Design a protein around this motif. Structure first.
Motif, PDB file in Angstrom:
ATOM      1  N   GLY B  10       3.411   0.536  -5.184  1.00 19.16           N
ATOM      2  CA  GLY B  10       3.450   0.508  -3.731  1.00 19.16           C
ATOM      3  C   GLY B  10       2.595   1.621  -3.131  1.00 19.16           C
ATOM      4  O   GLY B  10       1.957   2.387  -3.859  1.00 19.16           O
ATOM      5  N   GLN B  11       2.556   1.700  -1.805  1.00 17.25           N
ATOM      6  CA  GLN B  11       1.771   2.733  -1.140  1.00 17.25           C
ATOM      7  C   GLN B  11       2.242   4.180  -1.526  1.00 17.25           C
ATOM      8  O   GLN B  11       1.461   4.951  -2.113  1.00 17.25           O
ATOM      9  N   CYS B  12       3.508   4.513  -1.256  1.00 21.82           N
ATOM     10  CA  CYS B  12       4.058   5.822  -1.623  1.00 21.82           C
ATOM     11  C   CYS B  12       3.908   6.126  -3.132  1.00 21.82           C
ATOM     12  O   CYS B  12       3.290   7.143  -3.522  1.00 21.82           O
ATOM     13  N   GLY B  98       5.307  -6.460   3.296  1.00 22.61           N
ATOM     14  CA  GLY B  98       5.813  -6.246   4.675  1.00 22.61           C
ATOM     15  C   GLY B  98       7.060  -5.379   4.803  1.00 22.61           C
ATOM     16  O   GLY B  98       7.955  -5.702   5.592  1.00 22.61           O
ATOM     17  N   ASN B  99       7.148  -4.287   4.028  1.00 21.66           N
ATOM     18  CA  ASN B  99       8.369  -3.431   4.040  1.00 21.66           C
ATOM     19  C   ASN B  99       9.664  -4.201   3.792  1.00 21.66           C
ATOM     20  O   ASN B  99      10.748  -3.877   4.330  1.00 21.66           O
ATOM     21  N   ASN B 100       9.578  -5.226   2.957  1.00 23.14           N
ATOM     22  CA  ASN B 100      10.714  -6.139   2.827  1.00 23.14           C
ATOM     23  C   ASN B 100      11.114  -6.185   1.356  1.00 23.14           C
ATOM     24  O   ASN B 100      10.337  -6.674   0.512  1.00 23.14           O
ATOM     25  N   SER B 176       9.518   8.034   9.194  1.00 23.55           N
ATOM     26  CA  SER B 176      10.004   6.678   9.074  1.00 23.55           C
ATOM     27  C   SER B 176       8.917   5.705   9.439  1.00 23.55           C
ATOM     28  O   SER B 176       8.237   5.927  10.431  1.00 23.55           O
ATOM     29  N   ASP B 177       8.784   4.612   8.670  1.00 23.72           N
ATOM     30  CA  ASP B 177       7.902   3.503   9.071  1.00 23.72           C
ATOM     31  C   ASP B 177       8.558   2.324   9.820  1.00 23.72           C
ATOM     32  O   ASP B 177       7.983   1.799  10.776  1.00 23.72           O
ATOM     33  N   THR B 178       9.726   1.896   9.364  1.00 18.54           N
ATOM     34  CA  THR B 178      10.421   0.753   9.942  1.00 18.54           C
ATOM     35  C   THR B 178      11.924   1.038  10.029  1.00 18.54           C
ATOM     36  O   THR B 178      12.461   1.882   9.322  1.00 18.54           O
TER      37      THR B 178
HETATM   38 MG   LIG Z   1       3.692   1.811   4.034  1.00 16.18          MG
END
Ligand SMILES: [Mg+2]
Ligand SMILES: Nc1nc2c(ncn2[C@@H]2O[C@H](COP(=O)(O)OP(=O)(O)OP(=O)(O)O)[C@@H](O)[C@H]2O)c(=O)[nH]1
Ligand SMILES: Nc1nc2c(ncn2[C@@H]2O[C@H](COP(=O)(O)OP(=O)(O)O)[C@@H](O)[C@H]2O)c(=O)[nH]1
Ligand SMILES: [Ca+2]
Ligand SMILES: [Mg+2]
Lengths: 440, 428
Positions: B10-12, B98-100, B176-178
């Motif tokens: 993932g991104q992180c 999608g952060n899901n 926080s992103d979402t």
């Molecule tokens: Mg992200």
């Protein structure tokens, strides 16, 4: 990849399309013939602006866009006008007879004659996409085509593209520029029909825009051209995340996650700043704090309603131009200890922020000042339901007498579609009330 | 046992993962080419733990890079140490998550996971004696969180006798992103409790606070947060990478650190806390290292250590210093504060020293604690989850991918069990 297809439906959809696409061309340095000198990759590419433009072998950058009207005269203006080389003739679709301000005609009588052809042209755009993200649909609520044809088209897109996202820019009617007595009927019928087919819908209240033009831009009697230039600025702010990239850029889809807590609760309030004349911008720089503050002034909203009298479920700030996080956070901290911002108890209160570094552009001969920084706030408030309450009240006054109903029945509709569409609206108004009640 | 296989998701995961390989590569004398250009022999003695040798003689990280989006992996590839990674170890989809969590675990991730396991198998087969796996990911998004925990489940099925460890970044409203991060975190913890052996809890709340309160950075970026992460990571893996007596492999670390299988979530600590670029000139005294490393303000998980008890502690001292002074100071901390160390695990604090300091410091200390105060971290996530979950808010993003509410209810209950299980031992 991540392509988006734009569909512009009816006079309002089409004329707003002209304004948006002209502005996109200026934002990316694309000329009226489609040539973009700065684009070194000829005939293709996976750049940010490729979400909105495809590319031909001859260096032409072509809107991923379809224009559709049931009548030919607004689309003929695109065909013979400044940006006519931009679009392949097959992207501009016209019939001969319009829907005459009647939803039944746009959805059934006239619209069924042209719907297969439109879906074939859309299919041709979709087939050129390597990773289609979804659709942006532009239309009025009040028009026969904007209401009836759009609702038909949305239903069919759900069939042909499954759950592929569909976003709407919907022109909510105002008495100052409206053209039909029956706009409240058309608005309720389309809203009921498309509600399950749409992921997210940005309502643009023509009266809010008319007021902003009169008050902030000193235009005595705003025309569609005035309104559309301002609308395009707001649309541009929303799509800017898709069309540019940068370190602090945050994708529209990621805002959407925060903006839609239940599928029916999908109507964000947009507020834009600064809207200012060249005369007043001169020697007056608006800082990050000034523009962010202007977002909580109700006179700056795209829909007339009062968020001070409802509750927030989300708050998003989309900055463009010369803006750094330090200043954003300072401005936000000030507003929080000074404004009427109450959230529902079930959602967290942090604002979500994206910054695009590319500053706003203006169109030659327009009314807005070229500014160094701009902001679009997208909020999810229970106050948006006021806009429904107003339209529903207008609908009820006429429907209690069945005024004009024979025009719809004559076209094959039943009274049961009216009461059914109205009940869904009552249930929607109720949904908005329930989400604002505190938890047990 | 020698070889560890590293997975970043993932991104992180991929951003902290890239920094980790950057930092440890410089410590082992490896340059962007994969060429050794160092002086000491301590640098190469256990290089096989993290690196493959392919004739050159070049060193290739045993590292698999995973994402559902190509973005952050293109960033890695054209980044500083980008050329070092084996190009075949880059495994990416196009569609994102999608952060899901549901997309990472069930729909989009399911489509990509077999390709990742092909690369894992190919790396596992070149190993004399694979120890196991480390994963870097966050819990708040969709890929590192949903797909990361999918991967862990599938890795455990295919290698059930290997150690699985994670560096897991916990979300915070402060950074926080979402809004769905608490949902994603709760679903991930449920997995971690059952399928990892040891999990380093990297709390974005703590990293933010350290940056704000202590490093006097008024607006922390991810870069600033990741500087703390890469220092902590270098520190916790020191005993794996360099010649040394105790916690020298992943299983021995687990055996000393984990008294009950579910309670394997560790609070790391680092001293001295430094910001990026700006150097500190005065080395710390052994008494100062020892005091700072135990200070709540040096903890990478926002839990107050005085609100619980330490089950076990591992401490790593880096640099040329007096081992006698280390033993004394370490003994002094315990004797002064004995009520905070459980009395039913004798001698529950173990100390290691390594001669090689990290870049830009003459002395450093890394703290690994298994405290019952970690429960505060899980209580916080639980509170955020319930605030939404009681109105079923935002759930349609998850039911749309095939999930039922039951799965949320179960994941919440299991996280609440973990909380009360910590409370059990804090009072025993
Ligand atoms: Mg992200
Ligand atoms: N903002 C804006 N609103 C417009 C524009 N054109 C029409 N409208 C609004 O849209 C409504 C009328 O619908 P139109 O879009 O003109 O109608 P249509 O979709 O062409 O439908 P028919 O002509 O009945 O087939 C009224 O509320 C108008 O004020 C425009 O260029 N800009
Ligand atoms: N410490 C740290 N946290 C991050 C970083 N990037 C994202 N996050 C956090 O990770 C979570 C989002 O997950 P992300 O890894 O972007 O999504 P994914 O790609 O779907 O796994 C949020 O809690 C962010 O605050 C980073 O570089 N460092
Ligand atoms: Ca190109
Ligand atoms: Mg018309």
């Amino acid at each position: 990849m991540r392509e988006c297809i734009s569909i512009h439906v009816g006079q309002a959809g089409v004329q707003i399309g002209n304004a948006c696409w002209e502005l996109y061309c200026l934002e990316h340095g694309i000329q009226p013939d489609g040539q973009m000198p700065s684009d070194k990759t000829i005939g293709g590419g996976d750049d940010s602006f490729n979400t909105f433009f495809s590319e031909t072998g001859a260096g032409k950058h072509v809107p991923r866009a379809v224009f559709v009207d049931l009548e030919p005269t607004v689309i003929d203006e695109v065909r013979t006008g400044t940006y006519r080389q931009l679009f392949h003739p097959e992207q501009l679709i016209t019939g001969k007879e319009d829907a005459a301000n009647n939803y039944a005609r746009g959805h059934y009588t006239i619209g069924k004659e042209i719907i297969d052809l439109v879906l074939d042209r859309i299919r041709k755009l979709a087939d050129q996409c390597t990773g289609l993200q979804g659709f942006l649909v532009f239309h009025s609520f009040g028009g026969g085509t904007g209401s009836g044809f759009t609702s038909l088209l949305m239903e069919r897109l759900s069939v042909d593209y499954g759950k592929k996202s569909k976003l709407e820019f919907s022109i909510y009617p105002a008495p100052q520029v409206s053209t039909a007595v029956v706009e409240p009927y058309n608005s309720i019928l389309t809203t009921h029909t498309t509600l399950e087919h749409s992921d997210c819908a940005f309502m643009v209240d023509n009266e809010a825009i008319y007021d902003i033009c009169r008050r902030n831009l000193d235009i005595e009697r705003p025309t569609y051209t005035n309104l559309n230039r301002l609308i395009s600025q707001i649309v541009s702010s929303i799509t800017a995340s898709l069309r540019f990239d940068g370190a602090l850029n945050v994708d529209l889809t990621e805002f959407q996650t925060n903006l839609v807590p239940y599928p029916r609760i999908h109507f964000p309030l947009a507020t834009y700043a600064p809207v200012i004349s060249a005369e007043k911008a001169y020697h007056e720089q608006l800082s990050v704090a000034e523009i962010t503050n202007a977002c909580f002034e109700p006179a700056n909203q795209m829909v007339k309603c009062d968020p001070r009298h409802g509750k927030y479920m989300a708050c998003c700030l989309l900055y463009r131009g010369d803006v750094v996080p330090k200043d954003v956070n300072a401005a936000i901290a000030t507003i929080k200890t000074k404004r009427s911002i109450q959230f529902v108890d079930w959602c967290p209160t942090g604002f979500k922020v994206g910054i695009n570094y590319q500053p706003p552009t203006v169109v030659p001969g327009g009314d807005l000042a070229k500014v160094q920084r701009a902001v679009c706030m997208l909020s999810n408030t229970t106050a948006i339901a006021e806009a429904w309450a107003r339209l529903d009240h207008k609908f009820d006054l006429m429907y209690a007498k069945r005024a004009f109903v024979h025009w719809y029945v004559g076209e094959g509709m039943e009274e049961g579609e009216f009461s059914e569409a109205r009940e869904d609206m009552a249930a929607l108004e109720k949904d908005y009330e329930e989400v604002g009640v505190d938890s047990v | 046992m020698r070889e560890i296989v590293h997975i970043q998701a993932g991104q992180c995961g991929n951003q902290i993962g890239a920094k980790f390989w950057e930092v440890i590569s410089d410590e082992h004398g490896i340059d962007p080419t994969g060429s050794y250009h160092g002086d000491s022999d301590l640098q190469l003695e256990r290089i096989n733990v993290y690196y493959n040798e392919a004739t050159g003689n070049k060193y290739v990280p045993r590292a698999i890079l995973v994402d559902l989006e190509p973005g952050t992996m293109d960033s890695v590839r054209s980044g500083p140490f980008g050329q070092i990674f084996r190009p075949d170890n880059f495994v990416f989809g196009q569609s994102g998550a999608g952060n899901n969590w549901a997309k990472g675990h069930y729909t989009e991730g399911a489509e990509l996971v077999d390709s990742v396991l092909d690369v894992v198998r190919k790396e596992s087969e070149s190993c004399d004696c694979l120890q196991g796996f480390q994963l870097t990911h966050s819990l708040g998004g969709g890929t590192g969180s949903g797909m990361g925990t999918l991967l862990i489940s599938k890795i455990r099925e295919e290698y059930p006798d290997r150690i699985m460890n994670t560096f897991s970044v916990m979300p915070s409203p402060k950074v926080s992103d979402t809004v769905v991060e608490p949902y994603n975190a709760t679903l991930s913890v449920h997995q971690l409790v059952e399928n990892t052996d040891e999990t380093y809890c990297i709390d974005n709340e703590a990293l933010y606070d350290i940056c704000f309160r202590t490093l006097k950075l008024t607006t922390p970026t991810y870069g600033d947060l990741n500087h703390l992460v890469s220092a902590t990571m270098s520190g916790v893996t020191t005993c794996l990478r360099f010649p040394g007596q105790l916690n020298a492999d992943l299983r021995k670390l687990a055996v000393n650190m984990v008294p009950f299988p579910r309670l394997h979530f560790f609070m790391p600590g680092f001293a001295p806390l430094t910001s990026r670029g700006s150097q500190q000139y005065r080395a710390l005294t052994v008494p100062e290292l020892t005091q700072q490393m135990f200070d709540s303000k040096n903890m990478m998980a926002a839990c107050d250590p005085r609100h619980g008890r330490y089950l076990t502690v591992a401490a790593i001292f880096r640099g040329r210093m007096s081992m006698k002074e280390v033993d004394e100071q370490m003994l002094n901390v315990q004797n002064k504060n004995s009520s905070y160390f459980v009395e039913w695990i004798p001698n529950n604090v173990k100390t290691a020293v390594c001669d090689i300091p990290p870049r830009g410091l003459k002395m450093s200390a890394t703290f690994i604690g298994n405290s019952t105060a970690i429960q505060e971290l899980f209580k916080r996530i639980s509170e955020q989850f319930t605030a939404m979950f009681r109105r079923k808010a935002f759930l349609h993003w998850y039911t749309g991918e095939g999930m039922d509410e039951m799965e949320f209810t179960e994941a919440e209950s299991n996280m609440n069990d973990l909380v009360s299980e910590y409370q059990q031992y804090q009072d025993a």
